Amino acid sequence: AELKMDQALLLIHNELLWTNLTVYWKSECCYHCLFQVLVNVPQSPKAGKPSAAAASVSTQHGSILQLNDTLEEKEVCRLEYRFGEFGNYSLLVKNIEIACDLAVNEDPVDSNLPVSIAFLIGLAVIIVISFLRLLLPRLRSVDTFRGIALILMVFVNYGGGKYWYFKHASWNGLTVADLVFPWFVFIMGSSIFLSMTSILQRGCSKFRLLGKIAWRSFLLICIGIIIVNPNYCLGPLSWDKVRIPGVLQRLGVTYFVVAVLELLFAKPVPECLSLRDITSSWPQWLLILVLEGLWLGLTFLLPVPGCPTGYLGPGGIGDFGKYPNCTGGAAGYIDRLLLGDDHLYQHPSSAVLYHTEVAYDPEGILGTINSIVMAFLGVQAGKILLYYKARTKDILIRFTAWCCILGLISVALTKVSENEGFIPVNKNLWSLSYVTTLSSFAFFILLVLYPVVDVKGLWTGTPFFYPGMNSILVYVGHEVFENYFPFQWKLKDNQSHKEHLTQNIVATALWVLIAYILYRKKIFWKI
Amino acid sequence: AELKMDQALLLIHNELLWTNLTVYWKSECCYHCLFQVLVNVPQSPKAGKPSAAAASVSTQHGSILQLNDTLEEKEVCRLEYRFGEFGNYSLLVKNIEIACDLAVNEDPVDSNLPVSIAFLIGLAVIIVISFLRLLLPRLRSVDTFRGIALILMVFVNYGGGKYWYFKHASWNGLTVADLVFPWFVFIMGSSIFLSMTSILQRGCSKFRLLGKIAWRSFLLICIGIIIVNPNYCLGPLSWDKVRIPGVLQRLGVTYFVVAVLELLFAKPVPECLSLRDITSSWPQWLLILVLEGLWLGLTFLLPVPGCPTGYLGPGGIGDFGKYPNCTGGAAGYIDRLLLGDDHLYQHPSSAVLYHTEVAYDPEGILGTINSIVMAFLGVQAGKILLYYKARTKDILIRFTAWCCILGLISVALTKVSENEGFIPVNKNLWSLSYVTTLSSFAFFILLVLYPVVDVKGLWTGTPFFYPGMNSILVYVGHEVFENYFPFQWKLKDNQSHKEHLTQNIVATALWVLIAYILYRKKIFWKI
Numbered sequence A, B: 001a002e003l004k005m006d007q008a009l010l011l012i013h014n015e016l017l018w019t020n021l022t023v024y025w026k027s028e029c030c031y032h033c034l035f036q037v038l039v040n041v042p043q044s045p046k047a048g049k050p051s052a053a054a055a056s057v058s059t060q061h062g063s064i065l066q067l068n069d070t071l072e073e074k075e076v077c078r079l080e081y082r083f084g085e086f087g088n089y090s091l092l093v094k095n096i097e098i099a100c101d102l103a104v105n106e107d108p109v110d111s112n113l114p115v116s117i118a119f120l121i122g123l124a125v126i127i128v129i130s131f132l133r134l135l136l137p138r139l140r141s142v143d144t145f146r147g148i149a150l151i152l153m154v155f156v157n158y159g160g161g162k163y164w165y166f167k168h169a170s171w172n173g174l175t176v177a178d179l180v181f182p183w184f185v186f187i188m189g190s191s192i193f194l195s196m197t198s199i200l201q202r203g204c205s206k207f208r209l210l211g212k213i214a215w216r217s218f219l220l221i222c223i224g225i226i227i228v229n230p231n232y233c234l235g236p237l238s239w240d241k242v243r244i245p246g247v248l249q250r251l252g253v254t255y256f257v258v259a260v261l262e263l264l265f266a267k268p269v270p271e272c273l274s275l276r277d278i279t280s281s282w283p284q285w286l287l288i289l290v291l292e293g294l295w296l297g298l299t300f301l302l303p304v305p306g307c308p309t310g311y312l313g314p315g316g317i318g319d320f321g322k323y324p325n326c327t328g329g330a331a332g333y334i335d336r337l338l339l340g341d342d343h344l345y346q347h348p349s350s351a352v353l354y355h356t357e358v359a360y361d362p363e364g365i366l367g368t369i370n371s372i373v374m375a376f377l378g379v380q381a382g383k384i385l386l387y388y389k390a391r392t393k394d395i396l397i398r399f400t401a402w403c404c405i406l407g408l409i410s411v412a413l414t415k416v417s418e419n420e421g422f423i424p425v426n427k428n429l430w431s432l433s434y435v436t437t438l439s440s441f442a443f444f445i446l447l448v449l450y451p452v453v454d455v456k457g458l459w460t461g462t463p464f465f466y467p468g469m470n471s472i473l474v475y476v477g478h479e480v481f482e483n484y485f486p487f488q489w490k491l492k493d494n495q496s497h498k499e500h501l502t503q504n505i506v507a508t509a510l511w512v513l514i515a516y517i518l519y520r521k522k523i524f525w526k527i
């Protein structure tokens, strides 16, 4: 029909002669949204001639429908159902009492079939190549894990097949899109410590290195603002529309703060139950815990005008529509106070599901504290790798212990619930529990990749370390060349998951190939 | 007022009570355009109350106005005048006989003042630096002259201040925009011979070099089609809208043909009145003259359906509107027959002044013959430089003789007239006289640059050889980053020549600086 992607048709037939009905729709994904009007169905004029009206219901999450008499304002009938994509459904409001029956006129399609098939294709290629091949300085695992994070960032930015789980969550919880930036920050902290230790061991001065750190940070911030943020298809750059926060700006600020902290308190690596790497850097831990206490205090105790104190919700229609302009809480208030709504992100992810009107920037000022905490945990991983490079058992024990500690903290904060924790997982706020959850994930990934890629050498990292060696050039590249063929062509069906998924997979594989080609030519750009 | 850039206001007052008037406007730049309706002025209803109507007239070229009685269809009054930018003019159609008087209510502005001031600023900086500095393998002149051509290409592509002489001519004649692509083709031929001779002297095989030539040509064509032509701000690429011809596609075809010809007939350089470089390559000259005869025959003798034979005009309203869909003649007919109107250039330069509706591609199939002839003349310049490298007098004599011969041929063809020659100068057709004119210009530029930059060493080429060493990266770069700040920001006045000129000059100087930075880092990309 005229159905768009991820929608179904709902035909509502009114068999009642006396009472009109109004239909209210609420998603199950919401936490405390309001019911929104779906369609108004008038009363049947004559017996045997039911009135009809159609509507489109979202099929990404389960739906909650409410039937209310428009004059009486009384609930005659309520049903909750999970509609399928491109379905054709009929709802009949019978008489004798009032009851509703939902019939499936046409069965919906399987929307996740291309994703199921894509994993089978990739799994088959892995087995075929492994079967085919069998018949016939730097840590590799850090580059491999950086390349995996970057590859998924490229796939997600292109759209992720237009799938709701390859996109960012509206407010709370995790999708696959929410995993890949914290992991990159973690790895960047590891690389900060490893590179700094090698450089200082070679005998370089700390002031030349400080100048290099400042130059790299300034370059990243400027590249983000001037190249990566703006949509130059709309028009030329004007200052009043410039968005100051961003991904590369926050990488730059995090890089400066973490690198300068490590450089200031740098120590030579000494050469087995011990806490040597934890106690030899107690000043850094002291400053990190003080900074984290600052984030917690400004988040739960800063009074925001016209808004509750310590509010972590999305606003819009969320929390029963009480707080419509309070998207973010103190984080958004600080962003608006210091930068103004026109220098923020005008399309927050909460807009689709909570219908928020205010601009909110996920990469704002207040969450940089937790970005820094994430990168400092990555630094701790690098310290584990260098202080105990001789012994593999020591490295693995420390990775496992850190994963368990951070996972226990995350379980305590979130209460293993999406919206009911003390600090729920939230990318937009860059919560504490978001950091601890994604850090335990990164410690587990290192625990698995270090033996396989580095100790045993079973796997060489292919093809993931090729973009892990040219991360900055690949990230800037796909932003500049996002609309260019062959990364993007014209689709026969823009309402198809299969066609979008094929386009995005092809474009991501092309950036893996481009990075491999740059590796063969030894064209490594280090910002 | 509401006047746009390069327009004036013309108020027409009708003092006549009985006859209406219609006003016809024709530009002086046209060759045989039709008069187009400007505005209809009704008769004055009562004596002493003249009727009024306003119009905007283009001020780039002189205007020709015709006053015709609408019923009688008889010419009551005609005047030709050159209106100035943003002027406020009044035209009064008096009675006793009928006479017209044009009065300047408000004087126009000086539109060329920013260009006059810009040359004074640049001239002052040259004198200041020369005064300041005084108080305190490869041929350099070829890189210098390539950099000058490329710098002007960047300035012209950005817009050239929105000045009509920094844009391409509508059909015939020369502007500053029409000079810089033929010069680049000339220099590319010189570089082809110089590089090939050095490579073959080092002992390289001709098949490895043939593979390199084919690879470079294929890369240039593909880069042009996929990166340089499309406007990806409009949408994703669809095949039916893909434009096949272009600047880099024609560089690729010309490079392949000329490089393969030289490689096939390559000879070692022997070590003073002689014609050694002209006679040692007689096969190349034979094929070039045969190819030129093909261009002349297909242009003046190919029968084009529904069109005169040997037609070199623009169509539209040109040539008195007889031939509206004949833009190009045989060149456009061959393009349309082999590629179809949707794979051609939809905005030819003749559209503005002759109002042509058909798509015409300046870089089409038929003019590649003359592109090849231009590059082969460049090859002859390289042969002069190598065969006689010991003697400067021999090099200068040969450059002067070639300039005089080509200039005499161009004077014979064009009859020193813009539209009345046998083969007028025309970028869109890539005429023979266009090639000979621009080749004599390039020989004269070499005659001046070779002693100054190479023999005496008075000038080192700065800052022009920095982009001459990275021409391909600079050309692709400014196409990718054309809309990006700092190359383009939002203008306070979009109807100002001063603001556009400042923007374009700043952007061009920024690309000179970028190429200097790439030279300092030794990042030279050779396609």
Ligand SMILES: *[C@@H]1O[C@H](CO)[C@@H](O[C@@H]2O[C@H](CO)[C@@H](O)[C@H](O)[C@H]2NC(C)=O)[C@H](O)[C@H]1NC(C)=O
Binding pocket: A001, A002, A009, A088, A089, A090, A105, A106
């Ligand atoms: C959804 O399904 C219903 C079936 O209930 C379709 O209704 C049919 O509509 C056509 C034309 O409008 C009628 O000729 C049929 O008699 C209807 N069938 C029934 C059972 O009433 C409806 O068209 C479908 N909508 C779509 C496919 O977009």
Ligand SMILES: *[C@@H]1O[C@H](CO)[C@@H](O[C@@H]2O[C@H](CO)[C@@H](O)[C@H](O)[C@H]2NC(C)=O)[C@H](O)[C@H]1NC(C)=O
Binding pocket: A024, A035, A036, A066, A067, A068, A073, A074, A075
């Ligand atoms: C549909 O009607 C029901 C009535 O059964 C509404 O539910 C009541 O809403 C009022 C607010 O107007 C509350 O004070 C009551 O506590 C609710 N429950 C009951 C049992 O009355 C419901 O709000 C209506 N739907 C919408 C979207 O307004």
Ligand SMILES: *[C@@H]1O[C@H](CO)[C@@H](O[C@@H]2O[C@H](CO)[C@@H](O)[C@H](O)[C@H]2NC(C)=O)[C@H](O)[C@H]1NC(C)=O
Binding pocket: B001, B002, B009, B088, B089, B090, B105, B106
């Ligand atoms: C162009 O110049 C004429 C002067 O002839 C301007 O006409 C004036 O218009 C204003 C308002 O429309 C009147 O109050 C004046 O009396 C007019 N002057 C005369 C001498 O008639 C006209 O406005 C100008 N157009 C512009 C500046 O856009």
Ligand SMILES: *[C@@H]1O[C@H](CO)[C@@H](O[C@@H]2O[C@H](CO)[C@@H](O)[C@H](O)[C@H]2NC(C)=O)[C@H](O)[C@H]1NC(C)=O
Binding pocket: B024, B035, B036, B066, B067, B068, B073, B074, B075
């Ligand atoms: C304006 O009127 C003049 C008449 O003086 C037109 O000039 C004549 O045009 C006809 C064509 O309709 C020719 O056959 C004549 O040779 C032209 N000259 C004369 C002296 O009659 C002129 O064409 C009219 N302007 C426009 C735009 O049609």
Ligand SMILES: CC(C)CCC[C@@H](C)[C@H]1CC[C@H]2[C@@H]3CC=C4C[C@@H](O)CC[C@]4(C)[C@H]3CC[C@]12C
Binding pocket: A289, A290, A291, A292, A293, A294, A297, A298, A301, A302, A303
């Ligand atoms: C360094 C770590 C341990 C924490 C430092 C920051 C703490 C001490 C600061 C940051 C923001 C501060 C809050 C800001 C505003 C208000 C005003 C008033 O209504 C009571 C105090 C209260 C609620 C402050 C309490 C202290 C506070 C939470």
Ligand SMILES: CC(C)CCC[C@@H](C)[C@H]1CC[C@H]2[C@@H]3CC=C4C[C@@H](O)CC[C@]4(C)[C@H]3CC[C@]12C
Binding pocket: B289, B290, B291, B292, B293, B294, B297, B298, B301, B302, B303
């Ligand atoms: C190699 C150089 C010297 C020239 C070779 C091309 C010449 C011989 C060819 C190219 C196109 C040809 C023309 C194409 C079509 C027509 C058809 C008819 O109406 C008479 C011949 C005529 C007019 C041809 C004459 C010869 C021609 C001009």
Ligand SMILES: CCCCCCCCCCCCCCCC
Binding pocket: A151, A152, A155, A462, A463, A505, A508, A509, A512, A513, A516
């Ligand atoms: C999350 C989906 C993205 C899919 C990316 C898979 C990468 C496939 C790599 C293909 C190119 C390999 C080039 C290097 C070979 C040595």
Ligand SMILES: CCCCCCCCCCCCCCCC
Binding pocket: B151, B152, B155, B462, B463, B505, B508, B509, B512, B513, B516
């Ligand atoms: C046709 C107008 C374009 C103006 C271009 C002039 C170039 C000015 C160069 C400024 C940057 C110099 C960098 C290299 C210094 C050694």
Ligand SMILES: *[C@@H]1O[C@H](CO)[C@@H](O)[C@H](O)[C@H]1NC(C)=O
Binding pocket: A018, A019, A020, A042, A043, A071
């Ligand atoms: C139902 O709505 C219609 C308007 O569409 C209205 O005229 C009618 O009065 C309503 N029903 C009742 C019972 O009021």
Ligand SMILES: *[C@@H]1O[C@H](CO)[C@@H](O)[C@H](O)[C@H]1NC(C)=O
Binding pocket: B018, B019, B020, B042, B043, B071
């Ligand atoms: C002039 O034009 C008007 C229409 O604007 C028309 O009514 C009038 O008749 C014309 N003049 C003559 C003399 O016909």
Ligand SMILES: CCCCCCCCCCCCCC
Binding pocket: A173, A174, A403, A407, A410, A411, A414, A416, A417, A418, A425, A437, A440, A441, A444
């Ligand atoms: C959507 C809510 C997510 C909450 C995540 C809670 C689990 C924390 C991690 C558990 C241990 C991780 C070991 C790899």
Ligand SMILES: CCCCCCCCCCCCCC
Binding pocket: A165, A174, A175, A176, A441, A444, A445
């Ligand atoms: C199904 C909808 C949400 C998708 C789940 C993503 C969050 C958990 C990812 C687990 C990754 C584990 C890596 C060690």
Ligand SMILES: CCCCCCCCCCCCCC
Binding pocket: A207, A208, A210, A211, A214
């Ligand atoms: C000997 C080389 C010195 C190079 C510069 C060192 C100092 C750099 C200071 C950067 C501080 C930035 C503050 C925002």
Ligand SMILES: CCCCCCCCCCCCCC
Binding pocket: A211, A212, A214, A215, A217, A218, A221, A252, A253, A256, A257
């Ligand atoms: C030797 C080159 C020094 C250049 C320094 C430029 C300023 C950098 C400051 C960046 C700070 C960003 C994080 C606060």
Ligand SMILES: CCCCCCCCCCCCCC
Binding pocket: A205, A206, A207, A210, A260, A263, A264
């Ligand atoms: C070998 C020279 C050692 C000198 C100590 C260098 C410490 C650098 C501290 C950086 C602080 C910057 C604050 C913005």
Ligand SMILES: CCCCCCCCCCCCCC
Binding pocket: A278, A279, A280, A282, A285
């Ligand atoms: C050289 C020994 C110094 C010991 C200082 C006290 C230990 C500080 C460790 C802080 C770690 C907190 C997070 C694990």
